[PDB]
C-alpha cells in the first residue's frame, strides 16, 4: 500500500502540482504543502536543544530513511546517537506540537552506510533508523515506496521532474509549514560541469537551468528529506532520492545533489531483513 496517500490517491483526488510531474514524464522558492500531501515526511528533531535536525522519510511502520550526514559529519563535529534525537511523523507546521495529528517516536538503532564518504564528497549519503515501536498509519502518516530497477530506469531521466519537501530555510527565514517544490532531473554532464566536487553514480542532481526561468532548491534543514516521483504506471509515489548536498541554495548555474536511492537499495534490503 506504499505511495498511495490517504487524502489524495486513496480518494482519487489530486494535489495542485502533481500534474506538472506527470507532464514532464514524456526549501527555496517553493510553496506551502497541502494537508496530507507528503504523509511520509519525517522530521528529525534534536532533543537538546530542541531544534530542527533534518528531514527524513517513512518507508515502513518501523523504518525511517535519511541522509547519513544528518547523523554523522566530522567536519562540522556532528555525531548524533539514538538518544540524541526524536522522530516526528505526520507533521505540517514546523515549530508547533500538532496534538492529535503528529506522532513522536524514539529511535532504537541507527544504521549508516559502511562506505558513506564524509571525507570527500558525501558519496553514499544514506542512513536508516529503526523505531522502537511501530507507528500507526493515518490520513497524515503513510509510507512512501522504494524504487525497483524498472521504476528507476523509466523515471530517473533528465527533464523528468521530482518533488522535494522540507522545513529547511527559505533562503541561502524559516517557513511556517512544510514546503514543497518540483524540480527536473538534470543531465549528468551538466551536473558535473556545475561544480568542482567529484560526482559519483550514487548521486544525481536536479534543479532548473538559468535559461529555464523557474527556480527552486533545498537548503539548510532539508537534508535527509525525500525527492519523490509519482509513477505514471501504477500511480504510486516512489522516493528516488535523498536531499544530500549543494553549494549555496538556489544559485544560478548550481544544482542540488541527491542520494540515488535505487543504487543503494541492496544495502537497504540487507539492513532491513537482517535487523528489522
Amino acid at each position: 500500500d506504499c505511495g498511495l496517500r490517504p487524502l489524495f490517491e486513496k480518494k482519487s483526488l489530486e494535489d495542485k502540482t502533481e500534474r506538472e510531474l506527470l507532464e514532464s514524464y514524456i526549501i527555496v522558492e517553493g510553496s506551502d504543502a497541502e494537508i496530507g500531501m507528503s504523509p511520509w515526511q519525517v522530521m528529525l528533531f534534536r532533543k537538546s536543544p530542541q531544534e530542527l535536525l533534518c528531514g527524513a522519510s517513512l518507508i515502513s511502520d518501523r523504518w525511517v530513511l535519511t541522509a547519513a550526514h544528518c547523523l554523522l559529519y566530522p567536519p562540522w563535529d556532528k555525531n548524533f546517537t539514538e538518544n540524541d534525537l526524536l522522530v516526528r511523523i505526520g507533521k505540517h507546521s514546523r515549530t508547533r506540537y500538532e496534538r492529535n495529528i503528529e506522532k513522536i517516536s524514539m529511535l532504537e538503532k541507527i544504521y549508516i552506510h559502511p562506505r558513506y564518504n564524509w571525507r570527500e564528497n558525501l558519496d553514499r549519503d544514506i542512513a536508516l533508523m529503526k523505531l522502537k515501536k511501530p507507528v500507526a498509519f493515518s490520513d497524515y502518516i503513510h509510507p512512501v515506496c522504494l524504487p525497483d530497477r524498472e521504476t528507476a530506469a523509466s523515471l530517473l531521466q533528465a527533464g523528468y521532474k521530482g518533488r522535494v519537501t522540507g522545513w529547511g530555510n527559505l533562503k541561502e527565514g524559516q517557513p511556517s509549514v512544510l514546503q514543497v517544490v518540483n524540480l527536473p532531473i538534470v543531465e549528468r554532464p551538466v551536473c558535473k560541469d556545475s561544480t568542482r566536487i567529484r560526482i559519483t553514480d550514487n548521486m544525481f542532481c536536479a534543479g532548473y537551468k538559468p535559461d529555464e526561468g523557474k527556480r527552486g532548491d533545498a537548503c539548510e534543514g532539508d537534508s535527509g528529506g525525500p525527492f519523490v516521483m509519482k509513477s505514471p504506471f501504477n500511480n504510486r509515489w516512489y522516493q528516488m532520492g535523498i536531499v544530500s548536498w549543494g553549494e549555496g541554495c538556489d544559485r544560478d548555474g548550481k544544482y542540488g545533489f541527491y542520494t540515488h536511492v535505487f543504487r543503494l537499495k541492496k544495502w537497504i534490503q540487507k539492513v532491513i531483513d537482517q535487523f528489522g
Binding site: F45, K47, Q50, E51, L52, L86, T95, R96, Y97, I104, M106
Partner: peptide
C-alpha cells in the same frame, strides 16, 4: 522557537 512537546516522549 519550538513549542514544548509532551514529557512522555522526552523521558
Amino acid at each position: 522557537d519550538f513549542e514544548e512537546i509532551p514529557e512522555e516522549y522526552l523521558a
